[PDB]
């Protein structure tokens, strides 16, 4: 009696269960793996903390209301302060990792709503100022909090129009990227396994965000008559096949 709906994911000393899943997506059908010799350039022996960093970290919950526009997190940024994973991030010159993203949101058979959960490799954001204005470091490194698409523009920050994916492309085409939907009537969780995707073997984990995770309401939230007009959304992420290289002083980053 095994179902696409019931699943368990165990990484390190952390386990996740869901009784209302919709299968799981493995980006471009590729499971994360360590860096093979044939592709390596950096000559340093790498460090593989394994279970101390390859475990689930739960971010702060977001509140989905009738007016929510969506949220955007960036990796590895979002976990920059998570236990040993975070520490290794700043103590090493280079690093590479994959992840298992698990977005949670339950309601009742009376509610309705549909969230788009998508992973976008190299999600280079646009400046709301147009022209040739840049987007300052801090604004693409929100950390665990993430970027709230319904928040107002701010000097040095990115444009936050859900309709244009924060980058001049249409929302409807976000589906070309590995994604999954959390359709309250069907779902309650979305799971995406992300393999390391980059044009280099390994890379700086502080100055470059490999992918960004977006949770975007498409069909708006609807609650039954007289019910609390909101639902919480929780994001849990676990790094996997994490490798660190070039250990040293420990970066000091903007702000």
């Amino acid at each position: 009696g095994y179902s696409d709906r019931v699943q368990q994911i165990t990484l390190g000393n952390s386990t996740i269960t869901t009784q209302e899943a919709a299968n799981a997506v493995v980006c471009y059908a590729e499971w994360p793996e360590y860096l093979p010799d044939v592709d390596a350039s950096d000559v340093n022996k790498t460090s593989k903390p394994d279970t101390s960093v390859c475990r689930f970290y739960t971010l702060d919950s977001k509140t989905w209301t009738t007016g929510s526009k969506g949220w955007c997190w960036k990796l590895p940024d979002a976990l920059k302060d998570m236990g040993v994973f975070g520490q290794n991030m700043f103590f090493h010159s280079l690093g590479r990792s994959g992840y298992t993203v698990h977005v949670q949101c339950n309601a009742t058979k009376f509610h309705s709503g549909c969230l788009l959960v998508v992973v976008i490799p190299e999600h280079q954001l646009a400046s709301h100022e147009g022209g040739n204005v840049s987007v300052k470091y801090t604004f693409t490194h929100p950390g665990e909090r993430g970027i709230d698409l319904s928040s107002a523009n701010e000097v040095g920050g990115p444009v936050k129009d859900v309709l244009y994916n924060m980058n001049g492309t249409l929302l409807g085409n976000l589906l070309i990227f590995p994604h999954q939907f959390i359709n309250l009537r069907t779902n309650n969780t979305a799971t995406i396994v992300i393999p390391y995707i980059n044009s280099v073997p390994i890379d700086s984990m502080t100055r470059h965000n490999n992918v960004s995770l977006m949770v975007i309401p498409i069909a708006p939230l609807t609650v039954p008559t007289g019910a609390t007009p909101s639902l919480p959304i929780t994001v849990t992420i676990a790094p996997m096949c994490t490798e660190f290289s070039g250990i040293r002083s420990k970066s000091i980053v903007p702000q």
């Binding site: 549909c114 929302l171 085409n173 070309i176 309250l184 009537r185 069907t186």
Partner: protein, 236 residues
């Protein structure tokens, strides 16, 4: 000296020609290839991935709402939506399919049109999707639509219905650019029974529509698209 005769066209620069040319960087050794997931070989590969259709054009500006097809409770016989099938224009123009299709002049094959219900689990409904092949008008009522290719969709556990728009044509290819002789027909949706909401539940439920190509698909005669332009060269 080998005697030769130069032919017309000599000295011309055909942007489409594929010849050899001397390398300006002799002995340069390019960087090793490393494995990168998600390799794309053919555009026909990616148009088989469906994206959301902004079926609900009706708004004053681009909005998440243009992707939401409204469904109304306790309506019988009525029409939910309609559209012609010029995949290179209208609702389709901005979709991945429409976008890629516009890089070519001709298209052929079958389209995959899907509808995902997002209303509450305890609600129910039966809709009917219909494809009206060229030669007659877009259907004006369910009876008329029902006479052609269609699918009666029962909303339930499996949230999505996939209706195929089978390649129905005499000439084996059509123009991506809207052309009458080459029209693809019409697509419409109607209430088979009606949408029923459960107690303590109120308002509107929406449908999400998707479009993608079947392995049937063919695209040819590459050309520039009308989906991008500029007045002056961009600068840094």
């Amino acid at each position: 000296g080998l005697p030769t005769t130069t032919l017309p066209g000599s000295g011309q620069f055909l942007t489409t020609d594929d010849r050899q040319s001397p390398s300006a960087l002799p002995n340069y050794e390019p960087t090793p290839r490393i494995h990168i997931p998600g390799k794309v070989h053919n555009l026909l590969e990616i148009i088989q991935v469906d994206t959301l259709i902004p079926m609900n054009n009706t708004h004053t500006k681009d909005e998440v709402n243009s992707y939401l097809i409204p469904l109304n409770a306790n309506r019988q016989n009525e029409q939910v939506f309609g559209t012609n099938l010029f995949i290179g224009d209208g609702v389709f123009k901005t979709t991945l399919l429409g976008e890629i299709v516009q890089y070519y002049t001709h298209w052929s094959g079958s389209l995959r049109f899907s509808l995902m219900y997002t209303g509450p689990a305890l609600s129910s409904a039966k809709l009917i999707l219909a494809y009206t092949p060229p030669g007659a008008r877009g259907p004006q009522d369910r009876r008329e639509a029902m006479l052609g290719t269609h699918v009666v969709w029962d909303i339930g556990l499996q949230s999505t219905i996939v209706m195929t728009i089978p390649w129905t044509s005499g000439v084996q290819f059509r123009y991506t650019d809207p052309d009458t002789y080459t029209s693809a027909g019409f697509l419409s949706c109607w209430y088979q029974t009606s949408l029923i909401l459960p107690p303590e539940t109120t308002g509107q439920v929406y449908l999400l529509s998707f479009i993608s190509a079947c392995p049937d698909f063919k695209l040819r005669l590459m050309k520039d698209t009308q989906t991008i332009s500029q007045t002056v060269a961009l600068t840094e």
